[PDB]
Structure formats: structure tokens, C-alpha cells
Design a protein around this ligand. Structure first.
Ligand code: HEM
Ligand SMILES: CCCCC[C@H](O)/C=C/C=C\CCCCCCCC(=O)O
Length: 465
């Protein structure tokens, strides 16, 4: 491939980044922000300013990678450093996390990265026999509540009930603890939501006019002191509930305090927060796929469970070809977390589809994942949600290009890489979610709106089996 100069520029000091921020948040939105520049520069690799800039991030300047050939450089731990860039060009204060640099911020060259990721592998493995029954019990209560709400109001707000459900499910599945039996009661979602806001506010819009939003959430960090007592309630819950896991933390050579802050973060931020984005998104996309798809899913799921003597098991799920494919297609079409960063460790040559680009050691690389996973040079019908895309031997090959986990779907997270520690768990619970829907309902209708993180979704009809 021909070597091309990386196009784009960062504009003037101060005002360049501000104008780009306004495009990103207000005047274009993320997807068009990136696509308009791909068109202007005739390139899927270019220089751009990223939020937050201002007084939050020292340096907004990145090289953006917006196709599925160049993007995977971001997984290569021999090419990029992954230290303190979980959230991009700024890092939330460690005051927000008990004074520790939590696992998600650690480069694999740091010894505690290996220890803490092993702790999480253990948490997940040791929960294996509680996941199915607790998911089935907690999500059954959710759909009960949504039917109730639909009957009263003519619509049922998914997110406002499902957030409680997700935390209850995680407390019961991971820690054998029902939050209702603790001092947290039903408060966890509100507590976690406020704390996540204090971490992520520089990257989000809450729909307020820019004249209010810009000085309030886009210019300076929100003070960690204001969420410390809320965080303390969560900390004490984990300290008191995570006993069996903390025994393993002890064997792995992790202090009780460090392990507890990490368990808090993995459960509340990575898992519950990731589920808060994914599940409403899935409901939106599957809803849009229409009633014929719903009926095919119902028929497959119910038939397979019946073939399995009414017992839902991991083996039964392997038989549900459309269900598996629909979950992967949700993850491809709409990656729940769109922003991955890495800093070049050395001089690199990054290949795209039609040219190669040289980057210098120290340059911040950035990828907007949806442009890599809807790359029309890799996927046919790239902008179409195709339920059956991954069905069959040939369909399954394309999974190497599904990147939601910060690595190919065909790869495994390890202590040596920065791929999502909960990769298998996420795919499993997404499957169980679809199963629980279509074992109960033939089809459904939805109303949809925007949310700071993912999607706001109401059910307007739930057609019972
Ligand atoms: C739908 C839910 C989830 C989504 C969308 C998601 C997504 C991601 C993504 C995109 C990253 C890469 C971060 C980066 O840019 O470096 C990541 C990393 C990570 N995730 Fe997940 N995740 C989810 C659930 C979970 C679960 C269940 C766990 C349980 C352990 C988990 C633990 C982690 C950890 C520890 C990392 C950092 C990995 C490392 O340092 O090597 N996540 N996740
Ligand atoms: C509330 C968000 C929880 C997602 C946790 C998941 O494990 C990984 C997150 C990885 C990067 C941190 C930044 C997350 C910002 C999400 C909103 C904007 C976007 O999609 O990039």
C-alpha cells in the first residue's frame, strides 16, 4: 500500500478543540462528526480533537482509526500502551475509587493487572452455577413489573425498572446476596448512577442546552467529595457481601481493601453500567427487527427448551442459532462502548484499506468502534441489522470482526491483554435476556428515545405466549 500523510488538523489553540467539541456533542453528534470528516479527508484515518479538552484533559489531539483493518492495532499490547486511558485523554480522580488505580486503568506490564484480572476470572467462574437460576428469577420479576406498568399506563419504561433488576441479579449471582436484605435496600442504582456521572460527565451530554452543559459538565471535573458518602455505602456492601471472593483475593496476594474497590468497580461500573447500555439497545434493535423475527426467535427458543426437557442449560443455548446470531448482531451493529484508546509505544505503520500511515511513538490512537464494525469493506449489508448474519459456518467466521470486548470475538481475554474480563459472561447474559423475552412473549412493540449513555425504551405491547 502507498504511504499517505495522515490528513486532518487540530485548528487553533483553545478554539479548535472547542469547535470540534460542539460538533461532537451538539451540531453533528458522534457518528456524523466522524463520517463527515471521513468524507472531507477521503480517509478512515485522520487527525482530530476529542472531548473533553478544556481543563479536564491535557491534550485532546488523537489519530482516529475508523475502519476494521486499522482499528485492531488498538488491541496489540506490543504496539500500544494501555495505561490510564480507559476513559480516553483524561482519567477520573483516584479519589473516586478509594485512592487506587483500578484494574481497568492498568497496563498489562503492571503486576497487579495480572492479579486483579485473575480475581475477576475467579469471581465469574465461581458464579457459574448461580447465573441461570438467579437471572431467571430476577428477570421474571422484571417482566411481571413491566406487564403491571403496561396495564396501568399503556406503556412500560424499561430502563427505570431494569436497572434495579440488573443490580439485584449481580448481587445474587456473584455474591449470593439479595440487596433487599442489606442496608443498600433498593438504593444501588441511584448511588451507582451518580458515581458513574462523576466519572464520565466530560464525555456525555444530558440534553441540557450547551450554554448550561458546557460550563457545568464539559469544562471542569465535578468534585469527588460530593459522591464520597454514596460510594461508601457501596463499599460497605461489597466489603460485607464479598466474603468468599475476598478469600481468593487473599490467596492471589491482593489486599482486602484493594480487592474490595476493584470488585465494586467491576460489578458497578464495568458490569452493571455495561448492562445498562446494552440491554435497552438490544430491546430497541430486536424490536425494530419486526414481528416475523420475534416469532422465529420464539419458535426456536421454545422448541429448543422443549427438546431439552424444559431445562435451560449452556448446551441448549448452543442449539439456538438465530438467538446466538441476533446477540452477536446487536454487539456488531451497536457496540455498547464506542471509544477505545491506545498510545503508540514505538513508531508504527498502520495499514488501512487503501493506504498505510506512519505514527510516531507517543501519539494517542483512538478508534470509534461502530465504524470498524459497520465497515462495508468487511461486512455486506453493513448498515443493516441482519438477525441471521452469524448463522452457519461462514457466518461464524465473521465473528473475528465483532469487537465489542476490545478484541476479536473469536479471541479470549487473558492476563496478557486488555480484552474485557467478562467477555463470556456478557455474551451469556445477553443470550439469557433474549431467551427470557421470547419464552414469555410472541412479539412486542417499543417506543424509543435518547439517553445520556445508550437508549431509553418503553414497551407499548407485550404479546404473551
Ligand atoms: C455489557 C457489559 C460490558 C461491556 C459493554 C463491556 C465492555 C468493555 C470494554 C469496551 C472494555 C475495554 C476498555 C478499554 O478501552 O481498555 C472492557 C474492559 C474490561 N472489562 Fe468489560 N464490559 C462489560 C462487562 C464486564 C463484566 C461482566 C466484567 C466482569 C469482570 C467486566 C470487566 C472488565 C475489566 C476488568 C476490563 C479491563 C480489562 C483489563 O484491564 O485487562 N466487563 N469492557
Ligand atoms: C457506564 C459505562 C459502563 C461501561 C463499562 C465497560 O466495561 C467499559 C467502558 C470502557 C470505557 C469507559 C468509557 C465508557 C463511556 C461510555 C459512553 C460513551 C462511549 O460509548 O464511549
Amino acid at each position: 500500500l502507498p504511504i499517505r500523510n495522515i490528513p486532518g488538523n487540530y485548528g487553533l489553540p483553545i478554539v479548535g478543540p472547542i469547535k470540534d467539541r460542539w460538533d461532537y456533542f451538539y451540531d453533528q453528534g458522534a457518528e456524523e462528526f466522524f463520517k463527515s470528516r471521513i468524507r472531507k479527508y477521503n480517509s478512515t484515518v485522520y487527525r482530530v480533537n476529542m472531548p473533553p479538552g478544556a481543563f479536564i484533559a491535557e491534550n485532546p489531539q488523537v489519530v482516529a482509526l475508523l475502519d476494521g483493518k486499522s482499528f485492531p492495532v488498538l488491541f496489540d499490547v506490543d504496539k500500544v500502551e494501555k495505561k490510564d486511558l480507559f476513559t480516553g485523554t483524561y482519567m477520573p480522580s483516584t479519589e473516586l475509587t478509594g485512592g487506587y488505580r483500578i484494574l481497568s486503568y492498568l497496563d498489562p506490564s503492571e503486576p497487579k493487572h495480572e492479579k486483579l484480572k485473575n480475581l475477576l476470572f475467579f469471581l465469574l467462574k465461581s458464579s457459574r452455577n448461580r447465573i441461570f437460576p438467579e437471572f431467571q428469577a430476577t428477570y421474571s420479576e422484571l417482566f411481571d413489573s413491566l406487564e403491571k406498568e403496561l396495564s396501568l399506563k399503556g406503556k412500560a419504561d424499561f430502563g427505570g425498572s431494569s436497572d434495579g433488576t440488573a443490580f439485584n441479579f449481580l448481587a445474587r449471582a456473584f455474591y449470593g446476596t439479595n440487596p433487599a436484605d442489606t442496608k443498600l435496600k433498593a438504593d444501588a442504582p441511584g448511588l451507582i448512577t451518580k458515581w458513574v456521572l462523576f466519572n464520565l460527565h466530560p464525555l456525555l451530554s444530558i440534553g441540557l442546552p450547551r450554554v448550561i452543559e458546557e460550563p457545568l459538565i464539559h469544562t471542569f471535573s465535578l468534585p469527588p467529595a460530593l459522591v464520597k458518602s454514596d460510594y461508601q455505602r457501596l463499599y460497605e456492601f461489597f466489603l460485607e457481601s464479598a466474603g468468599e471472593i475476598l478469600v481468593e483475593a487473599d490467596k492471589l496476594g491482593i489486599s482486602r481493601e484493594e480487592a474490595t474497590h476493584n470488585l465494586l468497580f467491576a460489578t458497578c461500573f464495568n458490569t452493571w453500567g455495561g448492562m445498562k447500555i446494552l440491554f435497552p439497545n438490544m430491546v430497541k434493535r430486536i424490536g425494530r427487527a419486526g414481528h416475523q423475527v420475534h416469532n422465529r426467535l420464539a419458535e426456536e427458543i421454545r422448541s429448543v427448551i422443549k427438546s431439552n426437557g424444559g431445562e435451560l442449560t449452556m448446551g441448549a443455548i448452543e442449539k439456538m442459532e438465530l438467538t446466538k446470531s441476533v446477540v452477536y448482531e446487536c454487539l456488531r451493529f451497536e457496540p455498547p462502548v464506542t471509544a477505545q484508546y491506545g498510545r503508540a509505544k514505538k513508531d508504527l505503520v498502520i495499514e488501512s484499506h487503501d493506504a498505510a500511515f506512519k505514527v510516531k511513538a507517543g501519539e494517542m490512537l483512538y478508534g470509534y468502534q461502530p465504524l470498524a464494525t459497520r465497515d462495508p469493506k468487511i461486512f455486506d449489508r453493513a448498515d443493516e441489522f441482519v438477525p441471521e448474519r452469524f448463522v452457519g459456518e461462514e457466518g461464524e467466521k465473521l465473528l473475528r470482526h465483532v469487537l465489542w470486548s476490545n478484541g476479536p470475538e473469536t479471541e479470549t481475554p487473558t492476563v496478557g491483554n486488555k480484552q474485557c474480563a467478562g467477555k463470556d459472561f456478557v455474551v451469556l447474559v445477553a443470550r439469557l435476556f433474549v431467551i427470557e423475552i421470547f419464552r414469555r412473549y410472541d412479539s412486542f412493540d417499543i417506543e424509543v428515545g435518547t439517553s445520556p449513555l445508550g437508549s431509553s425504551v418503553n414497551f407499548s405491547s407485550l404479546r404473551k405466549a
